[PDB]
Amino acid sequence: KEICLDHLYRGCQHFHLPYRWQLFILPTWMDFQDMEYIERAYCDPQIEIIVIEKHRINFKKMTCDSYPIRRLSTPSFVEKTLNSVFTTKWLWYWRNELNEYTQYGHESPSHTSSEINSAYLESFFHSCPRGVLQFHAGSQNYELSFQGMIQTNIASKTQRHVVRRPVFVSSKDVEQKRR
Amino acid sequence: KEICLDHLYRGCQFHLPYRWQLFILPTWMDFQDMEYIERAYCDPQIEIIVIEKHRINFKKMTCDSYPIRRLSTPSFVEKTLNSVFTTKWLWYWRNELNEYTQYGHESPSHTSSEINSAYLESFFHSCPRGVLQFHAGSQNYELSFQGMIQTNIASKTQRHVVRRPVFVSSKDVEQ
Numbered sequence A: 001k002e003i004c005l006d007h008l009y010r011g012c013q014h015f016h017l018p019y020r021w022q023l024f025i026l027p028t029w030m031d032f033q034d035m036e037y038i039e040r041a042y043c044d045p046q047i048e049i050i051v052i053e054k055h056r057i058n059f060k061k062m063t064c065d066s067y068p069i070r071r072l073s074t075p076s077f078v079e080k081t082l083n084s085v086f087t088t089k090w091l092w093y094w095r096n097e098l099n100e101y102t103q104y105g106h107e108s109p110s111h112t113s114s115e116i117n118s119a120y121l122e123s124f125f126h127s128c129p130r131g132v133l134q135f136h137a138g139s140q141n142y143e144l145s146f147q148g149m150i151q152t153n154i155a156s157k158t159q160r161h162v163v164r165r166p167v168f169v170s171s172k173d174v175e176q177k178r179r
Numbered sequence B: 001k002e003i004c005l006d007h008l009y010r011g012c013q014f015h016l017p018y019r020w021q022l023f024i025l026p027t028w029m030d031f032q033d034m035e036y037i038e039r040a041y042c043d044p045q046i047e048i049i050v051i052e053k054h055r056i057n058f059k060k061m062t063c064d065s066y067p068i069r070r071l072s073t074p075s076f077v078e079k080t081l082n083s084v085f086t087t088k089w090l091w092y093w094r095n096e097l098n099e100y101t102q103y104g105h106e107s108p109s110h111t112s113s114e115i116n117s118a119y120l121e122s123f124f125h126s127c128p129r130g131v132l133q134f135h136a137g138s139q140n141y142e143l144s145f146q147g148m149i150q151t152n153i154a155s156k157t158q159r160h161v162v163r164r165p166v167f168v169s170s171k172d173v174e175q
């Protein structure tokens, strides 16, 4: 398990340059060509907008043709492998019609379930916190925006609040989980 | 050099898998009752918990208006690299010639802040939602990282703040 930090110190799962410029083409972070030219423009604080071949890069929004961009710093960090009980598992919920929380992938009060689950959403959120994601539940289509922490029915436009919280682990749970 | 990641995977500078802290400049302070805080946090219905007459708001991640964070315990150790591969971040403000002056360098009026890029990057790394006071010439300013603005406390004139790296060429890397 090896990470680099992006331009906002975000952990991202060395390279010949001290920097690596990428854009998110769902589901993969792709290397820009002309990384040194991008960096040189970026290091001029007067520059917001540049063109790199087919691409309009916007440093103020950190987007390129509406896709998120990032700058990885090269200094790598290697995880010290510990018992998995010390790793946080994140659950994802949406506010249902009974004004309660259903976990993604579990049954709504109307006997409907998303195909996406907490593991699917945490993996996408970790990779791409400014992501928007399409998903199915029952007979309906939805967009989830990590930035707004909302899901929207693409047909009706009804929004529901999204919440992300951990699986609870007590100090007792920690002792048991040391075999 | 060892880091761990917060609740939003941010790199930060334990017997539980979690460590709950609030930021009172200049220090991240440990909450007492970390396990009780975590138990409330793992209930997605809970936004407000009060402990010791201190009001935690999980929606804003504040406590009595100070930022809070939840550190994950798994540590990550820096791979030894030449320092030419380390990014240095410069901080600038929009001056009266609507050009950029680096913090700590002379304005068009021959005035300079005491604070510099190293001071601001260090504070920004620790506390991205930080608001801070600083002096330049004979005037006092507030700098909000979130707004990326400095405001003269007296006149209320705002100036835009920008953070960009020192440029390092592939040639610089070879030399």
Ligand SMILES: Nc1ncnc2c1ncn2[C@@H]1O[C@H](COP(=O)(O)OP(=O)(O)OC[C@H]2O[C@@H](O)[C@H](O)[C@@H]2O)[C@@H](O)[C@H]1O
Binding pocket: A094, A096, A097, A104, A105, A106, A107, A108, A109, A110, A112, A113, A114, A137, A138, A140, A151, A153, A156, A157, A158, A159, A160
């Ligand atoms: N992530 C989800 N997982 C499972 N079920 C979900 C999810 N989000 C919404 N639902 C279910 O979808 C139903 C409809 O809610 P939304 O799609 O959020 O929005 P709304 O516009 O109110 O309803 C659309 C509804 O109109 C009906 O004509 C049609 O059959 C459709 O279900 C609710 O019962 C809810 O349980």
Ligand SMILES: Nc1ncnc2c1ncn2[C@@H]1O[C@H](COP(=O)(O)OP(=O)(O)OC[C@H]2O[C@@H](O)[C@H](O)[C@@H]2O)[C@@H](O)[C@H]1O
Binding pocket: B093, B095, B096, B103, B104, B105, B106, B107, B108, B109, B111, B112, B113, B136, B137, B139, B150, B152, B155, B156, B157, B159
């Ligand atoms: N971070 C800074 N570092 C150095 N100099 C600065 C900084 N911020 C502003 N200055 C300089 O301070 C001068 C005044 O700008 P501000 O304090 O931002 O705003 P303004 O409201 O115009 O000034 C209020 C008062 O300040 C005094 O200089 C003067 O008496 C004026 O009435 C300008 O020359 C500006 O370049």
